[PDB]
Design a protein around this ligand. Structure first.
Ligand SMILES: COc1ccc(C2(CNC(=O)c3ccc(NC(=O)c4ccc(C)o4)cc3)CCOCC2)cc1
Ligand SMILES: [Zn+2]
Lengths: 46, 162
């Protein structure tokens, strides 16, 4: 798997759900830097 | 090579990272099945990840991409959630391990919605949920996401049926 020719990544943009934000894919490890490690719990709603 | 530097809750950087986490939660169409049911997180720790070599590898590539795209790296900050997080902080991201085809094919996935990344921390579809309780909506067990600097360059626009 590789970027479509002449692109460096893919943007996966929801066309139906208006509230959903984008996802993205890259094909080369060097194109990302893991800058923050966040440790968390999800919280039960009240 | 990787060191993790704990940030303190009153560090501005801790605060802006948390706000990005918290503010990009949305509802999901599975009603919580994969990632669980919640509207916000309890942030327990934020660590800066420092690896000189992974940083140099990143910026070197960022510069190549930029030159191919009218001096525009198209650099974003995006969430990544998966069971590979512990390996990734040590080895960096590695596309050879990112071979499963998703909505957008094989590759390394990132999300603008923290809550989307949260769906994958325990595997595809949430896997079997947490190691301890096998509960995809576990409110006890600690989760980890990465907030990553990602070079998009010229990004192929794929409209999704989602
Ligand atoms: C097993 O848990 C998974 C969770 C999410 C995924 C999907 C996304 N996978 C990825 O984003 C991804 C998978 C693996 C990696 N691995 C690495 O970068 C890596 C480096 C070193 C090692 C051991 O792995 C990096 C990213 C596959 C496509 O469907 C959507 C999500 C795939 C597997
Ligand atoms: Zn648990």
């Amino acid at each position: 798997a590789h970027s479509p020719p002449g692109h460096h990544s893919v943007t996966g943009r929801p066309s139906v759900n208006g509230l959903a934000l984008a996802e993205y894919v890259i094909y080369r490890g060097e194109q990302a830097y893991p800058e923050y490690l966040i440790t968390y719990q999800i919280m039960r709603p009240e | 090579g990787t060191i993790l530097i704990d940030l303190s809750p009153d560090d501005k950087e801790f605060q802006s990272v948390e706000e990005e986490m918290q503010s990009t939660v949305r509802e999901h169409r599975d009603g919580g099945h994969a990632g669980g049911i919640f509207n916000r997180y309890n942030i327990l720790k934020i660590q800066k990840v420092c690896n000189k070599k992974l940083w140099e590898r990143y910026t070197h590539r960022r510069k190549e991409v930029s030159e191919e795209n009218h001096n525009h790296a198209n650099e974003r900050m995006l969430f990544h959630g998966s069971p590979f997080v512990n390996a990734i902080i040590h080895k960096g991201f590695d596309e050879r391990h990112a071979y499963i085809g998703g909505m957008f094919g094989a590759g390394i996935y990132f999300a603008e919605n923290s809550s989307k990344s949260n769906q994958y921390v325990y595997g595809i579809g949430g896997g079997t949920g947490c190691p301890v309780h096998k509960d995809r909506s576990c409110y006890i067990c600690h989760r980890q996401l990465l907030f990553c600097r990602v070079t998009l360059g010229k990004s192929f626009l794929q409209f999704s049926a989602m």
